[PDB]
Amino acid sequence: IPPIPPVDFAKYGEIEEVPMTRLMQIGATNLHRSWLNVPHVTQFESADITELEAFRVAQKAVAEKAGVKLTVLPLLLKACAYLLKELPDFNSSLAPSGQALIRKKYVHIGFAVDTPDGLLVPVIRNVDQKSLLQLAAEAAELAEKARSKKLGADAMQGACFTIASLGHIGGTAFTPIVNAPEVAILGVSKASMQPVWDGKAFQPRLMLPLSLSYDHRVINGAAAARFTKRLGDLLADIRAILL
Amino acid sequence: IPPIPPVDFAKYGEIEEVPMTRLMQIGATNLHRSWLNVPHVTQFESADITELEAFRVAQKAVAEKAGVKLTVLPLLLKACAYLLKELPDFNSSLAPSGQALIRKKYVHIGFAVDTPDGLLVPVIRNVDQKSLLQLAAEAAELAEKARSKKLGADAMQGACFTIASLGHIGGTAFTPIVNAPEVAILGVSKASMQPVWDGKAFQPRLMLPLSLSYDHRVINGAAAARFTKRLGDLLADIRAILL
Amino acid sequence: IPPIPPVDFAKYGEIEEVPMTRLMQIGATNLHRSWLNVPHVTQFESADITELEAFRVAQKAVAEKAGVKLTVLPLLLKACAYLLKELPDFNSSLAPSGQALIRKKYVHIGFAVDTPDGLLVPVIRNVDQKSLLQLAAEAAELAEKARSKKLGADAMQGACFTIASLGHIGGTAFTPIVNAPEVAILGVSKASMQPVWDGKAFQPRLMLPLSLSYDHRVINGAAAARFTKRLGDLLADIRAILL
């Protein structure tokens, strides 16, 4: 692939060289390898989380009694695990022969933690089997170990899917890059009060922006549209996970 | 381009190998070839289809008398054909010498049909010359043949542009991949009632999300912004196609 | 990278060959080189410019007395220059060794001008040091020279960042391509009156759509979300640039 021509940046003013941590360099390589290997499409959707939010906030007592903080992330992890089982092509990878998908029968999900040294994506194993306060505890632990460089490379392996949440900082939507060999990554941005037509008038609903990027070789437009539609449906009423 | 390292997925749990149809493999190759060849940009726009929708629904009698279903797709195909003639760089392809555009003087448009075996994009020839009930009939036929594997490879050729509609499933917008050697593809998502400022107050208008991806080597930002603006203008009042 | 198969386009109808200006061909090459080199992510945000707009319009007298037109572009250039200093990783480039960032201590910003011959991106040097009417005058001059082929290649060099504004034509958002070796580009689309929840009811605020594409090897999701959040914050109240 043609390289970018070097420029003498100091011809234009003062420059300074800072170096990249080995973590950034690793990260840089993996993103570039994914970019050139995966033809990316991003499907955008918004989910009504007004009732989910009310639930979160009411269970503040129980979560503190348990010592966990219950954010949107365990609710997101539980719903994507239910969906990764319903729509199995999202829980799979392209076999190196280019002619088979390896469908995984397990659901481990990674989530992006941005640390000073670079991006880490710890993996919670068997998300489909853990409860909201279990995933809350564990997500929190893995993030603290990630920040404190105590995350062992074992916990960075064998994910089937990645959630990347930037809702705590800002933004309306973004187009994340698939962590190949996974086949999809869910970006989540900031929730806002939005007018939503109730058939007769506009009601304020709290809306969560979702950005699903996927590997278009494995997932086609209709399948990905159906995945963010079911996810918006499960987040609007998380009780559907019970049936 | 650096390959993705193989992972032993069975170290993490049970896996299963399903194979890809030849159609998926073909599709996989073509998308990857487009991805690496076309520097992609997506221009997003929303079009007011309140009046278009009213028209569609009122002509339900005539369409049933004709045996056709009149969806948004023939209305979309007629407007893009008028525009492909107004803005001819969208109806062209980059010559293999890298230094000429081949402007096509015909308008054939493909539309994406997602079938079990994979994606098919049948082509309606000379969309600029057919009427809304003619394109309605023909689109329906080609889709049935596509699903029923009776679509002959002849009808999959020589398109100038592609419409990919996922409005029947969901989503707010997506970033489609250009089917090279074409130079653009229109993605269409779900219509929603939206408040739109009338100069004095917010009126509910039915808004259609449009996502134009284009080949930035051939089309620059201003030209693509002008294309989705004219398309939003023609869909808001389809009578402008008459003049 | 696998080439696109040639098609005999004349099998389908009349075709015509128009040639590409040398400018388009140069442009075509540079975009393709960026595309294959930079793993791109776009972060979308909206900024409340109601008060900025009021200010613009009230200073119409002063700007005309000075002979300049004061558009949104000098306001945008001043805010990104303040931010390029606050968040220095956006004002830097990846060193050819792949293992260092060259942080620039100067702020020169380019802006996209679409001319008949192709795209030109003139550079205003030391944007951080010039005033709103100075940047207004200079932006206007450079654009006229760009259109009139009088722009000397000197003024097309050593930019740290690019603003690409299509707000004067249309669109809701787009995904621009990073001009490598820069690490980010801000796309700006059309402002619309939008309902924005004031804690109790929806107020019409004039909202500007921002689309920040970045080089994900150098900038991670949280940093880019923080950059468009600070930019939305500075545009909502440009007086924060004074402190």
Swiss-Prot record, chains A, B, C:
Active site: H216
Top-level taxon: Bacteria
Stretches for region Catalytic: 1-243
Bridged cysteine pairs (disulfide): none
Subunit structure: Forms a 24-polypeptide structural core with octahedral symmetry.
Family to which the UniProt record says this protein belongs: Belongs to the 2-oxoacid dehydrogenase family.
Role of this protein: The pyruvate dehydrogenase complex catalyzes the overall conversion of pyruvate to acetyl-CoA and CO(2). It contains multiple copies of three enzymatic components: pyruvate dehydrogenase (E1), dihydrolipoamide acetyltransferase (E2) and lipoamide dehydrogenase (E3).
The protein, known as: Dihydrolipoyllysine-residue acetyltransferase component of pyruvate dehydrogenase complex
Species in which this protein is naturally found: Azotobacter vinelandii
Lineage: Bacteria, Pseudomonadati, Pseudomonadota, Gammaproteobacteria, Pseudomonadales
From-to range in the entire protein, with total length: 396 to 638 of 638
